Amino acid sequence: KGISSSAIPYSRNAPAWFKLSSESVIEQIVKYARKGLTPSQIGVLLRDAHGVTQARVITGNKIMRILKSNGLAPEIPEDLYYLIKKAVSVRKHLERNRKDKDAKFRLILIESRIHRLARYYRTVAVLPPNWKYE
Amino acid sequence: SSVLADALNAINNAEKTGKRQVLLRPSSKVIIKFLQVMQKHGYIGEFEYIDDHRSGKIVVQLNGRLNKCGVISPRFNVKIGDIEKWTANLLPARQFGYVILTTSAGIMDHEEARRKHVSGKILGFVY
Amino acid sequence: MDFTTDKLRSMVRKWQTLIEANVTVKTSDDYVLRIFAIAFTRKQANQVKRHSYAQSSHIRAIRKVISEILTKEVQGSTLAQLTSKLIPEVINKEIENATKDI
RNA sequence: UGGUUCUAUUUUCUAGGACUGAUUAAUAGGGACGGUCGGGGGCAUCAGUAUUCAAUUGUCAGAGGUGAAAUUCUUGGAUUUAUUGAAGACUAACUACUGCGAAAGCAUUUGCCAAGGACGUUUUCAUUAAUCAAGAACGACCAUAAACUAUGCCGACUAGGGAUCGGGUGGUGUUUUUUUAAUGACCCACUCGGCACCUUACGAGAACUGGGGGGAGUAUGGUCGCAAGGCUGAAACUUAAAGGAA
Lengths: 134, 127, 102
Description:
Chain A is mainly alpha-helical. Chain A has six helices and no strands.
């Protein structure tokens, strides 16, 4: 295990060089989401190019709440969606060539990780119960 | 592990190794009250709560006077009539150290608890 | 053309990497030649660490430019031109100049 | 998206009504991104020289092999030499108290397929987490070896030191170099994470199944065994030949 994460500043204010509007950021957010990017991609594009540090600080609330209150909710949370599509990519690799025992092992690991947070999201009922991973 | 237990573990073995400062993270109200009662009885010196916005850090300065902290992991209820018995069974000696309790009136040691006549659940000990 | 075995045994030392490449190239005649190449990773002057290994992506990039520029030296030569090119060891100088960037 | 009517100049601007309402952001965990990293895996491709076999020469009497020999091959040319082809393996030196993998393990090139880790992150979710009984994954033909001298004090535990592998930041010199793209190598300091090594300080560290009782010896009027005699022939026979012994 390694310690490599992001270090959120002690400040909770806009950084006083951020001369943009607190609403034009939201309009850019919903524009990028409607052209089709995941919320982590919205956050990293907004951070890199239109220099909002983080939008829970600069806007009102966090950007998945912004997308759900502006009508662009996800069908399934981003974590579960990315782990689902990684699992189905490994599954198509396994149907293609069937002597990859290591990739079978990594499929068992990815499927366990699917079930863990699918169980969490189900008891929170973000997604409905009787959800199965096909 | 717990959050009071690893703080008291750091404050124990750092003093065994002979350091004059511990940094313990994270920090809760119960940790502040536990260090509060043990500096009220003179086992640690000053301590400081650095507030980062996550959970808080404590830098304790401690001289030599502690020799064991601990927590009693089932928080069983004790009575005012059995404070003396529980001190007899878990303390080193008769008047050596203090059992620390969570009471109605907050975190207190056993002798303050029976002084102002209130029982509670056990938390931990210091001697 | 071939080295003697004692030459490349005299070149191989531990604590470096040997990058070796080979290409099967057809010349400006219709001779087709399998032509090889060896190279050993130097250490710079002032280098104090004893290793001077290449990071294997530098090996893939060095082997890539070795293959490209020596298949450029063939196809642009006949057999007589290639022989007169590799007598005074100058394709080695072309490899060295093209690879000291890596 | 639908509908009703109110103000001054043939078309200008207007007002109203029906289809959300608690925190952080763990030197906890997950997910995304970025440049990468590795002898991690799978498929395909490429190469290398040995070995074995074969074809063609050249030459002639031996060649293996062993401590000596022998089985074996050989004037129907063995072994040696040269050219070439085919086969099945294998990846030499580089090769390390290095790397990667959950372990068993993994070393030629190039490409494809998915994967993984560390780092960077003012990205995202927000407790989704840790340990393991149970259970699951990996581990009629041609016939095979494994261990075998070893080591060490343990954990909830403090600091270090040198060297090395992967990433990052900064410095500002040399190799680099230029108006085709981006991209190095080394030196130094810091920092994160690894494989090890050399030390330090401080703690109860208690509460593929079947087992007699120490080590080195000694004695034996017990029990169970094995063992002597005495020239063979040769005993009911004083007995041949032949052999042994001296």
